[PDB]
């Protein structure tokens, strides 16, 4: 609805963005609307990687992180359209959630 | 004891200022976050100006009311430069609070 | 194509309906240029067809078998997959391409 | 080694042979696929499967059949069914219990 | 999902195969992990097929009525838009994906 | 395939380049392998718009302006896969034709 | 004004509000649409057919048909079938021609 | 002219069909790419390319196409990837292992 919005919270290099293809390597804290924190990978102290192109996750990680480039750390804002809809994540994500995650693109290989 | 008018416009604001959970339409702009703000948007406005608005019964119709919703995004439009997460927000609220009020 | 899906919201992408099983679905339909011709929202009363039994027109029977439980997606249909030549007198005219709002809400 | 640790080892060898990029060879971890120990309740591999047969563990071809078909349905239950995962955990669980299907 | 068309290079985006025409085609048809198990193009012969004629599989029967005349394509065809669980035996494995380079070089 | 390569003629700002819904203002000319001549905007003496993201133009024009910045003149070479193919354009264009367009990106709008 | 003029001139004004944002209003130049000229050899717009009723140039209704009618293919033939152009030729070329039925 | 020259030569000219403003042509002189031969310790282009073909040089066809390869390699070690040289390079190394398999 409001798809995915993109706030920087400190700027990448503005020039390398990750292409169809590329594995992106972040770190990620995953929070609902209301703050209530439901995964992180710095947490386990461990990025996460997947590859853009790859249907691997969900919409607004395909294009909230395609926006971002190399260094930069961003908070996606997900509509539930594009995160996890009627659904939800059962036991994770209740239905109808719109997400919030603190996003780091730390390297692309 | 509120107008049906008033009651009905803030039902709509609840609702608009829902989808600014960051309140970047909360407060006026000033010029000391936004320097040549006031010389570039003429007739400023907010959220928390149709606020006060609504509770002065300053509003004559919901049309009116849906011009200063219109100004206040397109005032973001206007003064940020469209890669900002302001102009994107705007854009975005702007086409969704029009579908939420019909 | 003779249906084409996009979705507007996803399903859990596992539940996909089978032949014989009940889809609980709301839709509103639509001609090409927008015009509204129906909505079972409008009836607060979501509409119900088991797959398989030849009860709705093709580009219902082959796109809703495309989604699954808890998608809501657009459903564009050529007239070849609604209802071509003939139309549906007063409702449909002939030669339509038809726009669906579909949400498959629950299968049965 | 007893005739049944043999056996299992045979077994084991053979399904091994159908996961020639090593899908099933270690537990899943979350850096990996994130939720995973919030979705999968019992987690199995080839790997603590080979443990389980050195150590013994085993007290009938029947109960390596649980951990294998244990260790496919966690994948089919985690992984979308378009992904790689899932099609070769639903490939290779029918070809295990056909190879072991005289038990 | 049941059939993908990726372009490699574009038809004249025009002339689109209808019920009744021969299609000829040069095609490479490959399983998931790439192995090869058929190529018109190995035999020197181009292959052709009517359309609307039930003699192909449904994700060719779909996808090169998505083609133009000049277009050479990508298809990857699900299992139930190909040989479903049974395959074709020898040839195609149970539950396999189909990708074939398709080129649509004429109708007749 | 070798796609469409893109070579600086002369150089952009290097910073403005075109997003999608934008509209481009081209001037170009567009002649085949051997050097023969098939269009130029220049000759008209009225530049060419379209608006990437819609279609409007051959993949080679779509991926190959996406990367100049307003200002810079190049040199695209395409080749067919990335143009018409095999149909080409009839009596325009013949078929699997590679195609060089010396564009120049004026300005976005 | 004759009476064929007066009958070709309300066939044009009911035709030009079914193209409201004037697509057909004038000749389609080589800038806006490169080689426009090569493809299409005999251009036609609505503006030239005012210009023919005003002119007298119109010997039957048939000949403003088939003006009308080159208009529309050679919309149907420059454009892609996924254009707007396309499709408001294609539905612009026969609700002419049932109104002038 | 031997079977092997025959068949190199066959391969290189369909190669630099995919170089056609020459890029490969020509040995890259440190004039033109200052520090050049600091870089790239083992220079290799299209022309030292037929030159070896022409004395019977080439062993094989696998020397020949680790030739090429190195040709690619080079020009992917000098210049940076947002060149035009960087890009040609990865592209043609795909193609003409593709072209000779
Ligand atoms: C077969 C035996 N084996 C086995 O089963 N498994 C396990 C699998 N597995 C695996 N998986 C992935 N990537 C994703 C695939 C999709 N996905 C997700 O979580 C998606 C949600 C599901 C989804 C998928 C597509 C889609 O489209 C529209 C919509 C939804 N999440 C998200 O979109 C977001 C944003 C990103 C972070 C998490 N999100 C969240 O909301 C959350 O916080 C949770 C999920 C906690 C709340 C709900 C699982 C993980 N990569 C790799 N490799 C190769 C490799 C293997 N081993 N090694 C050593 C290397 C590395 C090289 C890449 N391997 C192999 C082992
Ligand atoms: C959506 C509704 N809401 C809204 O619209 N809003 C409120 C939120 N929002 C905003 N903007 C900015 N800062 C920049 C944005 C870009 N810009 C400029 O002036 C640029 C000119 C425009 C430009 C930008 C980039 C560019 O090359 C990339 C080229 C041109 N000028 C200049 O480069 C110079 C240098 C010094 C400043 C003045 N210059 C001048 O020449 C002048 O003197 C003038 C301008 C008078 C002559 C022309 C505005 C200043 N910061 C924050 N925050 C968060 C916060 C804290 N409290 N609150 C409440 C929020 C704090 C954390 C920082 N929020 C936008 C307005
Ligand atoms: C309905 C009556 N009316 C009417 O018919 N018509 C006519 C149409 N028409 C039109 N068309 C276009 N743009 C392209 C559309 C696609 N196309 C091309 O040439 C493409 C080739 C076709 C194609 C399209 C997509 C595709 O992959 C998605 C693959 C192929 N070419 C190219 O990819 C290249 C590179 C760019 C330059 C040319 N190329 C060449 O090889 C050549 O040199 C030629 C073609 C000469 C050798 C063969 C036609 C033109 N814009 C606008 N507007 C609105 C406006 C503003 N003012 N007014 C008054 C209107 C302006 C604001 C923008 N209006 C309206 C009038
Ligand atoms: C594909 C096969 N082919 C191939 O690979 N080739 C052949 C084609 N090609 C090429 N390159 C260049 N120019 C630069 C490209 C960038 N660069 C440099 O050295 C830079 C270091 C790299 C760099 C670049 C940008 C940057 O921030 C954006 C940061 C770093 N150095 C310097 O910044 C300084 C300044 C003075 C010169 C040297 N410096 C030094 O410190 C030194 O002394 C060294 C390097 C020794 C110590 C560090 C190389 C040369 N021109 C042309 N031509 C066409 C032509 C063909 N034949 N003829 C007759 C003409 C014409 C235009 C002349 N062709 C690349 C090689």
Redesign the interface.
């Given at each position: 609805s409001m798809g995915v919005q993109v706030e920087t919270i400190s700027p990448g290099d503005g020039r390398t963005f990750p292409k169809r293809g590329q594995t992106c390597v972040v770190h990620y804290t995953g929070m609902l609307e209301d703050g209530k924190k439901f995964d992180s990978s710095r947490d386990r102290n461990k990025p996460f990687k997947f590859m853009l192109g790859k249907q691997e996750v969900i919409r607004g990680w395909e294009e909230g992180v395609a926006q971002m480039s190399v260094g930069q750390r961003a908070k996606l804002t997900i509509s539930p359209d594009y995160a996890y809809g009627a659904t939800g994540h059962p036991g994770i994500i209740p239905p109808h959630a719109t997400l919030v995650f603190d996003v780091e693109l730390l390297k692309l290989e | 004891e509120s107008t049906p008018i008033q009651q009905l416009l803030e039902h709509f604001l609840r609702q608009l200022q829902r989808?600014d959970?960051?309140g970047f339409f909360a407060f006026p702009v000033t010029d000391a976050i936004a320097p040549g703000y006031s010389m570039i948007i003429k007739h400023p406005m907010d959220f928390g100006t149709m606020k006060d608005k609504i509770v002065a019964n300053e509003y004559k119709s919901v049309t009116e009311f849906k011009a200063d919703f219109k100004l206040m995004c397109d005032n973001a439009m206007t003064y940020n430069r469209?890669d900002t997460?302001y102009y994107?927000?705007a854009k975005?609220?702007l086409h969704?609070g029009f579908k939420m009020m019909s």
């Amino acid at each position: 609805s409001m798809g995915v919005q993109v706030e920087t919270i400190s700027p990448g290099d503005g020039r390398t963005f990750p292409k169809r293809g590329q594995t992106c390597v972040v770190h990620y804290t995953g929070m609902l609307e209301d703050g209530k924190k439901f995964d992180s990978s710095r947490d386990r102290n461990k990025p996460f990687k997947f590859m853009l192109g790859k249907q691997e996750v969900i919409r607004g990680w395909e294009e909230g992180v395609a926006q971002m480039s190399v260094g930069q750390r961003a908070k996606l804002t997900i509509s539930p359209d594009y995160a996890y809809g009627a659904t939800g994540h059962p036991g994770i994500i209740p239905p109808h959630a719109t997400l919030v995650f603190d996003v780091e693109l730390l390297k692309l290989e | 004891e509120s107008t049906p008018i008033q009651q009905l416009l803030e039902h709509f604001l609840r609702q608009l200022q829902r989808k600014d959970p960051h309140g970047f339409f909360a407060f006026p702009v000033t010029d000391a976050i936004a320097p040549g703000y006031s010389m570039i948007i003429k007739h400023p406005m907010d959220f928390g100006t149709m606020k006060d608005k609504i509770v002065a019964n300053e509003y004559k119709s919901v049309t009116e009311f849906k011009a200063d919703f219109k100004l206040m995004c397109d005032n973001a439009m206007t003064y940020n430069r469209p890669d900002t997460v302001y102009y994107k927000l705007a854009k975005k609220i702007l086409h969704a609070g029009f579908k939420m009020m019909s």
